[PDB]
Amino acid sequence: NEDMPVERILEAELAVEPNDPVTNICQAADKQLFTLVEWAKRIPHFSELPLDDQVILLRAGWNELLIASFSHRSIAVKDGILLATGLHVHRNSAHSAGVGAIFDRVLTELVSKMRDMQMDKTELGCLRAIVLFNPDSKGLSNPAEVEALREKVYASLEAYCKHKYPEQPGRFAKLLLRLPALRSIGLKCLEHLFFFKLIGDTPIDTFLMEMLEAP
């Protein structure tokens, strides 16, 4: 926990911390892609990388990094999310808007589980830090150099997890067994945005718009 520490992995979390709703989310979603970059500048050694890589990593992981950041936010809200724009968004608002299916999935699959284990801000940054460092990403120049960084991160977490919640042995694996969901949700989540672009009646901003662009 010296090369890559939780302590900072927390700072990089404290620092960025914040009418048809499928729009309100999408705006919130644009606004966020900006602050996402400020975060990634503070999750150590991301910058040191070739800038060509910082691009691939982010285009491929914005969906999941963002979903995960809000879901964490929405531990307090009972049956809806807490968007960065300030509004609170209920499941029915969601349902009435034709997106009942995936919104429910974020709640059931991700938020409830976050709340059930009382997952902390560090634990989150770390899960995000892992997500950011995806070696599987195509076009990555040194995919191994990435492979490395995910490896240091996921170690620094266990050291935490083992430390801070010593009565909690399964925590580390529990924390990591929410990622396959994160991925799963993100794919279908993405699937829509392309749709909202395709049918053309949902406003989509410049940055959000850049990400839904063919590599």
Binding site: V37, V55, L58, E210
Partner: peptide, 10 residues
Amino acid sequence: HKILHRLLQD
């Protein structure tokens, strides 16, 4: 990927 780049440069 003009915007992303611009943000990462500075």
